[PDB]
């Protein structure tokens, strides 16, 4: 373009858009300017002064993080003047810093340590006493050792701009300036654990991870979160075959570089209540450890005796694709098609025939382009914490208009509350409601319906009513044509993949035709008890945790967890992503699909795949998008699906729309892994019982 102007970086010409800072100009020739207060996903602060750099023929040094480049500047990032500015600034930072590196969890992965080695001096000339600061208790997750704080104010900016919480700020003045909440408060948020990562020093550290490991001894495994349908990219840190912590992994289009606190601190649930050995019912009626040979023989003995409707299966929320296809193929060879999921998605009209019906067609990255957003019967803050964070980013940087139909929940950003009754959806179609114009005049509208709403008995109507609105907008030439309006926001990590494999959403089929033999493939919801089955139903539970499904099964086949297998999951937007093995399953547990593959051979209906590649070549046949990793495809044909939607007309219930999760307390414990976690248990107690209630020693 002609926008670009030319600047030099040590004599190397680079062309940059006007308004780019000096720090960004240096990044294009591959240099990283030192920093403490600058973060590319926060507002510029310019206070640490570590980024000071020299401009040739300029007497003064400029803050590289906050200085727009002007045409024809030569940035000297390695002149004597620049180096001495860095040494001076590092000296001031370390003057009052405590001698805590041996006792500080940040040791070995500290920007203050590393930048002191690279850009600071090798010795001190500070001959006075140091500052000491009392510690604040801002919750059971983040441990505060504020003597180490360097006052970069990153935490303050993150909470204000990213989490939408104004609890953190600076009280005092001068050298006594302190970071905290002033009062006794807990900075409890679904994104609270993120201030640990952005804090460059050991001032904010993870309480669950305190003291347990050092950075240099941990092996990094890149994997995917399965605690929600956003598919956040994580790093699983392991040491000597043990899961130590979970860190974020940068993905620009998904979670940027954040994760939720359930993603961050629920890994301790993998260390509790684990199913480690096959179990069968003895003659007295209790479950007893037994060998894989005895266990699979019983399951195979029953599987052959039944056919068709007799054999049914339910898929839990954390199940991987490879298991889903394996179980499906096993029940096909007995001629059963009662492949269910706990989650309910209306089958009226097209249903799962067209992917567009049950995907987030706009994509998570798309929200940054929307100009109006309608949320219906969904609390995105708790059902998809990282999606709501993307909303607030657009609400903040692009001036997005957000309207909500449902309970008046707090989204951390102000929204227009159209109301709570489902009938408001009808009005928007007619044009009576004043909001109907905003959708009409908006160039890039977006409509989000949450899968939590569709769990109502009138779910088919709501999806049709909401799809009715999206159809009106696109028909009028207001929309750009290739922009997609109708979006479904999912909350279960295995919902999209199951739907793409022809699973039948919900347990209506089972209730319609109670089965003789039932496979609970990780299903802990409680949807199907023994009240809802014949007298002697042969339940077989396959999962990694003992919680709700296991206690009622006849045979328990221990399975792996998402940290222990290379599996495929599809997130709410349709993107397929794969986990990797970080540690192997405990005890006698085995990978999920291998259990079903083995059950086949003992059954006689041997499946045609015996390795992970082969079972992933099968997924390609059933749905070719389940092996396109990190790629979002796209589902057209909204017109066709809409038409089938109106064929049968159903009545909206008069019940008001209420999301299942109304307050933070309902966010921490929502699945078997998080229910086992004890960090989540202390988080639930902290928000409910009281803030002050949880108080523990934090000497170092």
């Amino acid at each position: 373009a002609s926008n670009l102007i030319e600047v030099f970086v040590d004599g190397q010409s680079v062309m940059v858009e006007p308004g780019t800072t000096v720090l960004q100009a240096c990044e294009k020739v591959g240099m990283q300017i030192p920093r403490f207060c600058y973060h590319e996903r926060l507002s510029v602060a310019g206070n640490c002064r570590m980024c000071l750099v020299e401009i040739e023929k300029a007497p003064k040094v400029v803050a590289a993080c906050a200085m727009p480049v002007m045409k024809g500047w030569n940035i000297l990032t390695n002149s004597e003047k620049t180096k001495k500015a860095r040494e001076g600034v590092m000296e001031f930072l370390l003057a009052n810093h405590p001698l805590d590196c041996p006792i500080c969890d940040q040791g070995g992965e500290c920007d203050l340590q590393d930048q002191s080695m690279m850009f600071g001096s090798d010795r001190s000339r500070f001959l006075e006493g140091k500052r000491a600061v009392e510690d604040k208790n801002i919750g059971p997750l983040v441990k505060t050792i504020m003597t180490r704080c360097i006052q970069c104010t990153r935490c303050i900016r993150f909470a204000s701009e990213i989490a939408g919480v104004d609890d953190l700020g600076t009280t005092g003045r001068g050298n006594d300036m302190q970071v905290g909440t002033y009062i006794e408060k807990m900075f409890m948020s679904e994104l609270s654990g993120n201030i640990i990562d952005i804090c460059p020093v050991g001032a904010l550290t993870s309480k669950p991870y305190a003291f347990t490991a050092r950075p240099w001894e941990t092996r990094k495994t890149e994997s995917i979160d399965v605690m929600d349908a956003v598919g956040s990219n994580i790093v699983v840190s392991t040491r000597t075959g043990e899961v130590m912590r979970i860190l974020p992994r940068m993905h620009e289009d998904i979670n940027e570089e954040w994760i939720s606190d359930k993603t961050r601190f629920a890994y301790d649930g993998l260390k509790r209540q684990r199913l480690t050995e096959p179990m069968v019912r003895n003659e007295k009626g209790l479950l007893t450890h037994t060998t894989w040979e005895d266990a699979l023989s019983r399951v195979a003995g029953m599987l052959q005796s039944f056919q068709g409707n007799d054999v049914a299966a339910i898929a839990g929320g954390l199940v991987d694709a490879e298991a889903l296809i394996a179980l499906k193929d096993l029940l096909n060879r007995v001629d059963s098609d009662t492949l269910c999921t706990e989650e309910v998605f209306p089958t009226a009209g097209a249903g799962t025939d067209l992917r567009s019906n049950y995907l987030l067609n706009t994509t998570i990255a798309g929200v940054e382009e929307a100009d109006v957003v309608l949320l219906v019967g969904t609390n995105p803050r708790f059902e998809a914490p990282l999606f709501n964070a993307r909303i607030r980013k657009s609400w903040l940087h692009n001036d997005l208009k957000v309207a909500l139909i449902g309970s008046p929940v707090d989204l951390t950003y102000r929204y227009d509350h159209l109301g709570d009754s489902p009938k408001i959806l009808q009005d928007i179609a007619s044009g009576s409601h004043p909001f109907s114009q905003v959708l009409q005049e908006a160039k890039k509208p977006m409509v989000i319906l949450g899968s939590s709403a569709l769990q109502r008995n009138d779910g088919a109507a709501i999806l049709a009513a909401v799809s009715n609105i999206a159809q009106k907008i696109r028909t009028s030439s207001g929309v750009t044509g290739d922009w997609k309006v109708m979006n479904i926001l999912h909350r279960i990590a295995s919902q999209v993949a199951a739907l793409d494999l022809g699973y039948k959403p919900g347990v209506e089929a089972i209730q319609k035709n109670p089965p003789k033999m039932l496979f609970l493939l990780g299903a802990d919801g409680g949807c199907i008890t023994r009240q809802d089955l014949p007298k002697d139903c042969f339940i077989v539970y396959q999962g990694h945790h003992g919680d709700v499904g296991a206690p009622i099964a006849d045979v328990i086949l221990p399975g792996a967890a998402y940290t222990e297998k290379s599996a495929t999951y599809v997130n709410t937007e349709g993107r397929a992503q794969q986990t990797k093995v970080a540690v192997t399953p405990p005890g006698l547990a085995r990978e999920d699909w291998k259990i079903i593959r083995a059950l086949s051979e003992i059954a006689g209906m041997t499946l045609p795949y015996d390795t992970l590649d082969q079972v992933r070549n099968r997924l390609e046949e059933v749905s070719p998008n389940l092996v396109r990793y990190d790629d979002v495809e796209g589902a057209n044909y909204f017109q066709q699906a809409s038409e089938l939607s109106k064929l049968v007309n159903q009545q909206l219930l008069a019940d008001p729309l209420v999301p299942p999760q109304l307050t933070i307390k309902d966010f921490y414990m929502t699945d078997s892994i998080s229910r086992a976690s004890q960090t989540m248990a202390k988080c639930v107690k902290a928000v409910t019982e009281g803030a002050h209630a949880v108080e523990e020693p934090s000497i170092c």
């Binding site: 405590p98 001698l99 805590d100 006792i103 000491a132 009392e134 003597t147 000497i699």
Partner: protein
């Protein structure tokens, strides 16, 4: 603080003991399980608290360069004593 498990095995200061049915406790049959008897947690409790008259106090563990790195401790809070991260000694501010 050396208590024994119901089996008869002494528990260590880390809290480790071989459960009732673990075969690995055979390694001690005819021999002995070595357990240090001076529990660091119980010895550092006994130490008295050090009343002081300033808001900030520095601890190096004693001995100058034979102790731990020097740390400055804040004593503003009244509800609790201030503890050394390294040596565990406690301090309090006097009549204040």
């Amino acid at each position: 603080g050396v208590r024994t498990s119901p089996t008869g095995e002494k528990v260590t200061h880390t809290g480790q003991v071989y459960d009732d049915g673990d075969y690995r406790k055979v390694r001690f049959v005819g021999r002995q399980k070595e357990v240090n008897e001076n529990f660091a947690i119980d010895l550092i409790a006994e130490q008295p608290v050090s009343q002081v008259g300033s808001r900030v106090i520095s601890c190096d563990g004693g001995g100058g360069a034979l102790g731990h790195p020097r740390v400055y401790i804040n004593l503003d809070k009244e509800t609790k004593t201030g503890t050394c991260g390294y040596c565990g000694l406690q301090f309090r501010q006097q009549h204040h």
